[model samples]
Target: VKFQVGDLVWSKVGTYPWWPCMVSSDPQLEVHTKINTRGAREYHVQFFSNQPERAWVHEKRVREYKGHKQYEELLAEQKIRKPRPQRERAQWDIGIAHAEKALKMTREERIEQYTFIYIDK
Candidate 1:
């Protein structure tokens, strides 16, 4: 038992890479009354930054947390990229709408619109 409850440790959670965590009491085992197979040696750890995440990680994959410096450095590097969907169809529809509108406009309005857009870019 190299770790005790409340001990700070670095652990891998089967995702990404090893991250900062704090040892937690075996996570109210009764709520589980169920579990895994392996070394059967795992530690319940809560993330230092991610409050919503916690898990039992194998001892072989855990170690003493190096330091606050590494924590800060990891924070700087392990950033989540915002996922955005490309609205290509909507963009094409917009261009189509503008062209459709131009088709129904008066010659003067068409001239005005084209002239306005001439320098718009």
Candidate 2:
């Protein structure tokens, strides 16, 4: 569909969720479409963050965008840990969320800090 500048557009939710966003700039067709992944919505024109090179996932990650909203409020409500902490499994360690993601370890990805440190005493 064609949309003019300043028009509010909401992304469809599926593999790509086109959350609501204002048409900040005029629509333009992307020269490269190889970045489009499987099950990606066809895009004749690139919207706000709809670059062909990257997955348009920021739209789904963001809960709401209203001008100056708190970053904390945008996060999911419940985040319980699995594989419950066992004293004999391994030494306790803590780290920021991004650290885990950067290493690309799925089982240990996106973890917050503040874990216990086992002592031999």
Best lDDT among the predictions, by candidate number = 1
Model 2, 1-121: lDDT tens per residue? Answer: 2333232333343443223333222123322222245654232222233222222332233233332123234332366633535541221112112222223432222111211122445
Q: Model 1, stretches more than 4 Å misplaced?
A: 30-36, 69-121
lDDT of 1 by residue, 2-113 (tens): 7765455667566334555556654447221123585367777655441235677877777776453454454454657533335633443443344445446654564454
TM-score of 1: 0.48
lDDT of each: 0.52, 0.28
Instruction: Give per-model TM-scores.
Output: 0.48, 0.23
Top TM-score prediction, candidate number: 1
Q: Which residue pairs collide in model 1, if any?
A: none
